[PDB]
Write a protein that binds this DNA or RNA. Sequence first.
RNA 1: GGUUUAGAACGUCGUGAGACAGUUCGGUCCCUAUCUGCCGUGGGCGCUGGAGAACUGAGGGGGGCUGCUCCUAGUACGAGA
Length: 320
Amino acid sequence: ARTTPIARYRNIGISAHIDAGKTTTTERILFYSAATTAFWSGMAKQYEPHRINIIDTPGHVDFTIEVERSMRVLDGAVMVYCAVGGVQPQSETVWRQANKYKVPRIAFVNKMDRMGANFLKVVNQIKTRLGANPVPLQLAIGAEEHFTGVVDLVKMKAINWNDADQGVTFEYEDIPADMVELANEWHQNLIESAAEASEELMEKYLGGEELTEAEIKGALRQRVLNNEIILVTCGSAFKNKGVQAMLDAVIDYLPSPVDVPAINGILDDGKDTPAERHASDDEPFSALAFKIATDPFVGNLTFFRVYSGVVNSGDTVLNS
RNA sequence: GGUUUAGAACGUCGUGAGACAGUUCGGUCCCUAUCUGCCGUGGGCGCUGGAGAACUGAGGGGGGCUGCUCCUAGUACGAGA
Ligand SMILES: Nc1nc2c(ncn2[C@@H]2O[C@H](COP(=O)(O)OP(=O)(O)O)[C@@H](O)[C@H]2O)c(=O)[nH]1
């Protein structure tokens, strides 16, 4: 029946300011509002193939409905940022849009392939202008044009990409002394933040010991889910660099339809648990038409995400 | 071609001949350049013995126009556009 298990489902939005990189990263994704899916097994053929539902958005203030009418259909948000500008007024807009629907955000600081590109500065820019509290998942290696890869704060390796074929044949590297000290600094500032998921993690670290990356990734995913933090990654979609690890972070922190509480509905008016519903293949059918389109071919075409239920080709439905 | 000749007509003016910054159709435009000027082109003598050539260069003239496309570069600027 179901081709991919619900747990292997990511509903991600790519929203940012204008020309921040959205469509470029989406093309790099298709290689490695416009809704489109993909099957990204993993970076090392790990993570048996996930089905990532990507809703590429506009970033213009003119088309703000075209992103707000997808935000409350999405389950996660991949907020893109440029590395020379970072937070723009347009970035503040879609940010407030996502805060209105309480989306668990990660961030992707694109355009590290430009002059004046920074990563620390843009992280702090996010922390000061918007209000978010970001945990840097990556850290750039190569300032503006020397940008070759990043260091992780979980694997402690360098994913320096191979620039012979576009961005697919990356290598794992020895995280050399180019930056191998700030790496430690922010790795520790990441552990200290993932400790912020349970008292039993305070007692875990406060023993003077660094816990394991498995239960650090689980803890940080819990934090993204409760919207407690935001995980920022670092890439360059135009120089075919950094995109696959942002996809990894999407797999590892963004929510599946079951990694959240149920969707609360209404039976006939506001009741106690009127029609709270959970994403399941056995529920009564329920969806939400988040977008109407005008088919060039037909003139009518309705987008919808099924929250609870399973509909069929021909099934009657109720415009509740 | 127009404008202002001699023909003819219209409207109007006048009794009329005729007339009208009124109109209309028709209606002959000559000169072999002496001088200056200019464009070329030579003859004489001169430049101090005659000749053949190669130059220097005072000075004079000619020439000086610009579009579009691509690159720098979707770079600077610009929240964006
Ligand atoms: N230098 C550089 N240019 C990029 C990068 N990513 C995208 N671009 C350029 O941005 C231009 C338009 O961006 P676009 O994909 O439309 O993003 P949008 O503003 O969200 O629509 C393209 O011609 C790309 O070359 C990058 O990482 N570095």
